[PDB]
Ligand binder design. Sequence first.
Ligand SMILES: O=P(O)(O)O[C@H]1[C@@H](OP(=O)(O)O)[C@@H](OP(=O)(O)O)[C@@H](OP(=O)(O)O)[C@@H](OP(=O)(O)O)[C@H]1OP(=O)(O)O
Lengths: 150, 1366, 414
Amino acid sequence: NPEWLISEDWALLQAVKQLLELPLNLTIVSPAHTPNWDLVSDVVNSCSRIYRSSKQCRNRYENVIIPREEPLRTSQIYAQDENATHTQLYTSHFDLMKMTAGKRSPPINPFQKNPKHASVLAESGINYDKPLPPIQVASLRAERIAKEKK
Amino acid sequence: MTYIEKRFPEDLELNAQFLDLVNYVYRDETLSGSELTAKLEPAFLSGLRCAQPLIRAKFFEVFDNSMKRRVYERLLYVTCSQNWEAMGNHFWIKQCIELLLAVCEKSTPIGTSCQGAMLPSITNVINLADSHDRAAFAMVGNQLHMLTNRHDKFLDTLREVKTGALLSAFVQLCHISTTLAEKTWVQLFPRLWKILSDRQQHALAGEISPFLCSGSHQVQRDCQPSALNCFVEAMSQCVPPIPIRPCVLKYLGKTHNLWFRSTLMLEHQAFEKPQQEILDSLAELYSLLQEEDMWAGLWQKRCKYSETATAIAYEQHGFFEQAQESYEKAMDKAKKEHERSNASPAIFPEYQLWEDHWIRCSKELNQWEALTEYGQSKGHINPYLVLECAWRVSNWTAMKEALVQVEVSCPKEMAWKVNMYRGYLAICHPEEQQLSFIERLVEMASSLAIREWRRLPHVVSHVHTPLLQAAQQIIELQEAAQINAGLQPTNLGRNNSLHDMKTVVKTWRNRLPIVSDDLSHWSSIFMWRQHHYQAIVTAYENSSQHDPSSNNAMLGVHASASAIIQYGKIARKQGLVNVALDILSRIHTIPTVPIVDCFQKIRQQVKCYLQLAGVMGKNECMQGLEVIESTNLKYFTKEMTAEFYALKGMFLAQINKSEEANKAFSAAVQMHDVLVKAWAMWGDYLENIFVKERQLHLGVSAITCYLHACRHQNESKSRKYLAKVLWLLSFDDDKNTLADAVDKYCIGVPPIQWLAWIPQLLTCLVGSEGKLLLNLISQVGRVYPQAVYFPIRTLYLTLKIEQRERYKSDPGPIRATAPMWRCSRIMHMQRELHPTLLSSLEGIVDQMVWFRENWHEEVLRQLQQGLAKCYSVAFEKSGAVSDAKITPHTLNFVKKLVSTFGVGFSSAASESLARRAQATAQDPVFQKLKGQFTTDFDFSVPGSMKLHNLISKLKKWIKILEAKTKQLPKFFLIEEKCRFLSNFSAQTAEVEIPGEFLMPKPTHYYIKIARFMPRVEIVQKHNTAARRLYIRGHNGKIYPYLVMNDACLTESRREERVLQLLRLLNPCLEKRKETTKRHLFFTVPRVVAVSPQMRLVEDNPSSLSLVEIYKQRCAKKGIEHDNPISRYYDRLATVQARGTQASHQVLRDILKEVQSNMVPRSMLKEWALHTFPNATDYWTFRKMFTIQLALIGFAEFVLHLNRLNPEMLQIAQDTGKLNVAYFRFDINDATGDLDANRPVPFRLTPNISEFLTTIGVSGPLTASMIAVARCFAQPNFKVDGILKTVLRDEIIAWHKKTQEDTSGQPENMDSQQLVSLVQKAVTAIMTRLHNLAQFEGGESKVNTLVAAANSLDNLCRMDPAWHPWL
Amino acid sequence: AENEQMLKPHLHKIVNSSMELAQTAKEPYNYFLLLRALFRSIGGGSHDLLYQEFLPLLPNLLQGLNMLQSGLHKQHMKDLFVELCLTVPVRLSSLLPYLPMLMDPLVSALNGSQTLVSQGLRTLELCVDNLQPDFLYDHIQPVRAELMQALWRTLRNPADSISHVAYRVLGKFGGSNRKMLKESQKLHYVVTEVQGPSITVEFSDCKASLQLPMEKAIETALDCLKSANTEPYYRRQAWEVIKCFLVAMMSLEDNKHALYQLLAHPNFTEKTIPNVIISHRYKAQDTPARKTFEQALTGAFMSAVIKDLRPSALPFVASLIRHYTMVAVAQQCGPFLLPCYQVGSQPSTAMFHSEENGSKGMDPLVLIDAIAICMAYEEKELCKIGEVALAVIFDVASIILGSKERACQLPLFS
Ligand SMILES: O=P(O)(O)O[C@H]1[C@@H](OP(=O)(O)O)[C@@H](OP(=O)(O)O)[C@@H](OP(=O)(O)O)[C@@H](OP(=O)(O)O)[C@H]1OP(=O)(O)O
């Protein structure tokens, strides 16, 4: 799986912090406020990179956060360390790949009235040079229907 | 606790024993054991939710005593200290109801606070009336004494009932029923919140959100009535519940069945205005709801970079290539800005939008190779995109690696997607051909899809389209299973498997998705079919012995070619030519292909060239013509040559040559005279050259072409050609050449095709070309007697009524006119042919005449129309004087009204009704009323001629009459007077419901009237007391109808014409994308005119109007609905009192004050909120309202219809459909042309915009308007012909009306004036339609149109009677 | 082989006789059972001998079965009709000109019981597999909203196989499974703003009180008291709810001496009764309170029929009917006359409880509506309690007024 961005990591930390529970033991007084791992998962995968929020990752990366939170703190690494340069560089790479893909994509009066298209019609028995008015064509159709009926 | 209940659920004996054991453990010896209770919580909960009442009672009695008897303490307990995880898919909120109702006091008398519904006691009559009456009554056998004693004993027995007996039984009843108990919590929790003080409410609201999450309380995720759903509904239904996080709201909406409730809450937060998270979550949830329009509007409101708005506008209307280009430009500009300096983190959502929408666009544009190269990038592999776009290019190794990478991290919503991809892998992998687990994968995928379906709202919508599409590919995978099972060498060549393969291929060929689906799904289906088509082809190449006839490989080749051609056709229909050329270049790379499908490929190519030849260039069109001429025609058939020459003539008529095109059309029609399209296009070209050169020898030819094209084809297609035919009849000369032409070649055309145009040919029935049209209408009527009887009945009666006024000087009977005799001879012939059916129809019509009700509602409607006309004329005198005198016409109207005041075939029903009217006219009440009115309605006194004085007197009399007419019957039995209707039965005659033959249906299942229901109700609609008639059919369903008395034979006939126009335009909306995708359709009720004064219209019981809702809200507030107009006019008068003519600021401040004082813009919004308490129902109603309002606004703007007054708009509460009260073209009576140029294009008053919450307007409303504009703008539909055909008779009636005032020779208007006026009128609509259809640069004028529709600078100038505030 | 020759000559006879006789029979149930057995026997196996004689019977048989299943009938009768009309022993090859008559019962089978929905889905799959999609779509076009709505509702069925086959047939439909529905789906809505009846509950811990609406509660009570699947104790709880609702929605402010002095007046037995006519033709739409009252009254009348609830429901019902008729005769007769019952009055809305002014107090005439809806109930055993109610009304009216012929002039009887 792709590496975790510090932005989505701080987002996960805040989502866990917004569950009204402490990391010392994730079932605090008012035990009905058990940890909603699916909620923080939904809140995290809305970040820059791909979903990457299965049942495992949500617990694994929080258990990784706990040691380094109990070095710089996640909130400090978010406010510090080029706050928005990481996600912006990721998105710039994405846009560069987009442009490369879109660029390499493929771009995508000899009058000839040959005598074949007219010869087939002549063989069919109809004159092409002389346009038969629709009235005579209708009369011919009626005569053909009459012949068929007899 | 763990196993006894799992392995022995049915044997309730040991379960009850174990529950009694744990209850004893909890009850007795508590001082000794209190740690054991920790682990046995699931046992206690299960015993509490058991189905046995005694166990539940003994468990609740111990669960209640453990807590203080205080509502706040129990609420806090159940909200933060109690864990419901151990419950297990249970509706535990009923236990909350138990706990909250048990703490209530149950040692006091029972009572109720509903004083309005209190039942009076026996002795309550001792204090109601005055005193002395009862005082004298109080100072005034055994059979009665015993009764009184027993009754007093019984009453004493009742007074012993306490409130505790009610609550216990209420709770025991809520136990068994999950439904109607969720509602009890929803309705009781806010009541508890109301009594909680601020200190308690603050903490409770602050701790509810942790409880809304509550971690592992997710087993309810699959519960149909999930507990979190009810809890959040109740919490939101409170008054002060401000604090709730939008992220948790979106999570609950997605996971639990809270989609529409969550969206409503989020938008209610958003429209109250650190804070961008609300809009972010709302946009995410809208994109999750598949509601493209709302998402697009929200983002256009959020769009920072201008390129994003254009990209979203392009992608919203199917412009995928331009959308992709705009997205590329946008992200390039963003990359440049980033290289300049870092941007705020709030822009990341826009970047994700660009990413995913560029991915989607490239997916729609058949860029699978580019998508694979992108998702497979070394640094940022996107495994989901790769898994999606890998199998469509046969990259099975990449697909397998992406699958194994996704199966571990796939969203649970995409479980069925992962199953389908696993099946694709197992079926199509070269080195992993293991066809052992196939049906199991399909079963698991179907189960997961159904489980996801159970998580979606109950009202089907765009949210459910993904699963409805997935079903088809799942059943195809199931079929592919046996396909591959039969292609193996063990079964290869076997007839039993060959027949199954042939059948499955035929079914696939005959089973197709709909155009409303995106090209992505069409590709996902066709490419999946192509793999197995090729497998069939390849499988029959190494088994030359098996089936040695070169047929089964040809079968697969033909299947693949047909699938490719169908995919290209679908891509073309959606508006993609480049992908069409790509697919054509693809299909060209085959060793050999059939000759039948190559002709269809060439046909699709020439169709692409056709639809691309709108602004064709010389070079490109000549190259296309050369490519056309380069095709060989040696091994082809004959009819294909006819179609080819027809398309050639079309493409060359597109260019301004017109000679070789005529030759090619003639040659094609001679090659195959049965080819309908060729002859239709030839007739189109002939009509064009006739209208241009005006040669008589061409009109007959054009009409013959149209008729021969309409002969052998379906009516849906032939409609626009009959339209062209009917319009050409306005060019005939004195010799009536084209008349005899159409009369000579009409034998052969189906008679059903003329049903949709009976009114058009009836107007020509009165012209100099009569006799032949009479013969034709009689011939077509021999098959449909009623469809021709009703219209001729109405027209004959109208002609008789008109002649009665033309011969005012001659008393008694008079000689009939030529059209009268002409249309009555046909009725005589019909009665001779269909005597029973016509006699039953006559009986029905003569019985419904009894619906002439009385003088009360008659004079009420008369004075209502009088007040309406008074206001309409006063608006004209508003700005000038506003102290104006009544006009002569209005004076004559009111005089005639107050003089008649209600009393104004050889049949006997009319005579009996007149006798009854003269009889009931002998009472003194109505005589005294007439006297009092005449002593006031006289105008011969000074000071009463003022228009506003008349308006005030009319309002006074309106109030008096409405207070008088409130005591009348509301329904009557049909058997009282209508004997033939009550005695009507299916055995009498096979008569169909009125309005059935109007639109022909493919099937002949026409519901016949089984019998008329006995009850006939009276409903106040259209400012009149209409009579509602119910008719039942042989299917058991009931249809309601209103027998409306027009009282105006011209306005009703001009009104029911736009209904026919819309009904003709409705099919077209259903034949294009971006219209079916949005479910755009006109709601056109059925209206049939049975007589000049009466017409029968279809309706539904629950259909209010805007004015009805307004007056209902006013009565609720206790005010008069006529207050705002009177206030506007009072301000106008007081401003003009000092000579100053009211300026613009005057109107603006008047509107502002009347809106802020007595007409708040939030009236319709609160009305809708109260009407629809359910979030899903409210959302569906609002969406239907938005789309229907947009459609009718587009109609009333493009089509020059009268202003949509508020009382006209009918609003169906049961579906949300919006239909108006009979629009009509506002043709200028003076000039005779359409001049629909009001300040406001369509009704978008502040109340509506507030109901549409200001984003339904910017999104679905304008989106639907643009879609319907671009839809009708397509030339293939030829809506101009229908418009011309309708405007022909719309203007003929205008000319007839204008010439009647002065004074056969005058029976015909003119040979050149009528056509010129019709052409002038139709262009005014066509230009307005094209102006709206223009969508250059991702921008449209519809935005400026909707912006002007609600601008106060223009609304203030509208008519007060138009209610610019409602 | 041998018995098909003796049944063929009588097939048309028995079919037509059972069809024309059950129409005017006393218990037209065994005839439909016989028809179902005959259809099952003819369909079992490939006889190919009775098929020729049964073919000319579909034109009238199918029409009759459709007319039967379309009309209002008891649940079991409707189920039998829809199941015997769908399972016809005729191949689809010959049912083409008579296929349109099978969609109306199909949409009802899809909405019927588990067996009925299963049979309907079976027939739907049979017809979609054995026929071209285009013709089948043109066939279902008249009725598409109901069919699709039922197919979407049954998708949420608890039965796994039922939902699975529903999804399978929906996928078999193809793109037509999501085409635009002109007959848009219906959605629930409220018609009035006035609040329905409620019970007052108090809280002594916070010195406050609440209002408990009980419209849907009374609805649930009536629903669970009507159905036969409910258990006895739940029926008893619903009866208790209805009883407390009835007793809580009245004044209960009557005295013994005051009642005796009120009913013991010469005017009640000497003064002429005003001959005004009561007619629901002037009655407005039912308000929430009135419909809840009707539901409670019919639930009480039903409990009076329930065997285990009769001992306590019948006496309470009789006494409540006595109360209602006594208050009615007291308000519409005697020296005290309401402004709408005086001499010369005419029918008006003042007699009924409506959202408008109407009457001053709750309309006691609602008792007649309850008896009417009870006697018109699907079960005929309820007519007994309606007759008992009418009997006690007439008896107590004649008692309070004497001269039985005189107590019939009351507008209550009108
Ligand atoms: O479906 P296609 O082959 O692409 O062409 C169709 C077809 O007309 P033709 O098949 O004769 O070209 C339609 O009618 P059906 O045959 O499907 O019934 C219909 O044409 P009508 O308007 O005559 O119904 C439609 O046209 P539209 O886009 O106006 O709905 C469209 O023709 P196009 O080539 O214009 O798509």
